């Protein structure tokens with residue numbers, strides 16, 4: 130029953146995991162390894178997947194991150210989450226899976242719509258994802274959400290939530306803005322979010338304390354907002370120097386040149402390479418962090434899907450415990466590495 134340390138909004142999705150024959154991917158015109166949104170011709174994929182005995186597990190980027198936070202805090206209601214689901218059986222399944230973990234949730238039911246679902250197709254050591262948002266798109270933040278989230282000072286939203294309406298994330302960020310110890314955190318989520326919601330994201334970033342994103346997402350951000358010279362928008366983020374310049378330029382989108390006691394930090398995950406972060410410190414001076422990622426033989430890497438969500442989960446957990454920026458990154462790395470070494474987007478039982 131609390132205390133709630135982290136509150137997030139997202140697109141609640143039920144993952145249906147199953148091993149399928151190559152004929153399946155070809156049958157639904159899917160490209161092995163790609164993560165996409167179901168096309169009209171792929172709408173029968175979920176019903177068709179049943180003949181492969183799929184396993185139901187809670188999914189969704191933000192949901193995956195708070196589930197990590199909840200697992201680490203242990204106390205029921207340590208993390209809160211809100212999103213929209215359908216009035217279907219799938220919605221009940223997802224809801225029960227979450228209650229089972231002690232997560233505090235309020236799923237808004239959208240009559241006549243289907244709960245978000247993602248087909249996690251395992252084929253040739255490769256994962257192919259096909260997501261159908263459905264009811265997720267109907268989510269509209271309830272007027273009493275701040276009461277539901279009472280006590281939490283860490284707020285989180287994925288750019289994926291902008292696909293329902295940017296107003297949800299803007300309202301959450303709006304609540305935290307101006308309050309020194311209220312921390313709004315955001316994930317770039319995907320390259321298309323950066324372009325599709327350019328202006329809303331620009332406004333949202335001004336109200337953001339911590340921005341998470343991977344190399345490609347930050348690359349698109351830098352290009353869309355002209356953070357680096359056209360001659361540099363092509364450079365590889367695998368290059369420390371370039372990554373640092375991208376992070377430093379991105380930090381400007383959060384600070385707007387001003388300096389307060391509020392947290393202003395940009396974190397870029399870079400696969401096996403060191404995580405890079407740019408932070409505006411107490412007196413306004415910018416500091417760059419570089420945190421090495423413990424080596425993990427490609428041999429032991431099952432799948433890198435969900436790595437980013439787990440990273441954020443660990444980072445936010447550490448942040449709630451008041452750890453330093455470097456310590457938060459290390460916790461995120463630990464969580465990410467656990468998840469990528471086994472089937473599933475959750476922390477192992479032993480972890």
Ligand SMILES: Nc1ncnc2c1ncn2[C@@H]1O[C@H](COP(=O)(O)OP(=O)(O)CP(=O)(O)O)[C@@H](O)[C@H]1O
Nearest residue numbers: 343398399400401422425433434436437440462465
């Ligand atoms: N090859 C690797 N070896 C060790 N750790 C890794 C790793 N790949 C990812 N990680 C861990 O996961 C974190 C995030 O990885 P990354 O930035 O690649 O996410 P991502 O969304 O790009 C995965 P994908 O490439 O499948 O889309 C890294 O900072 C690290 O903590």
Ligand SMILES: CSc1ncnc2c1ncn2[C@@H]1O[C@H](CO)[C@@H](O)[C@H]1O
Nearest residue numbers: 140142188189190247260289292435
């Ligand atoms: C607006 S599109 C969208 N929004 C939110 N989450 C998404 C989306 N697409 C896929 N996922 C989730 O990513 C999780 C793995 O990182 C998978 O578990 C999958 O559910």
Ligand SMILES: [Cl-]
Nearest residue numbers: 139140190191
């Ligand atoms: Cl999400």
Ligand code: NA
Nearest residue numbers: 389410411413
């Ligand atoms: Na400052």
Ligand code: NA
Nearest residue numbers: 468471472473
């Ligand atoms: Na995994």
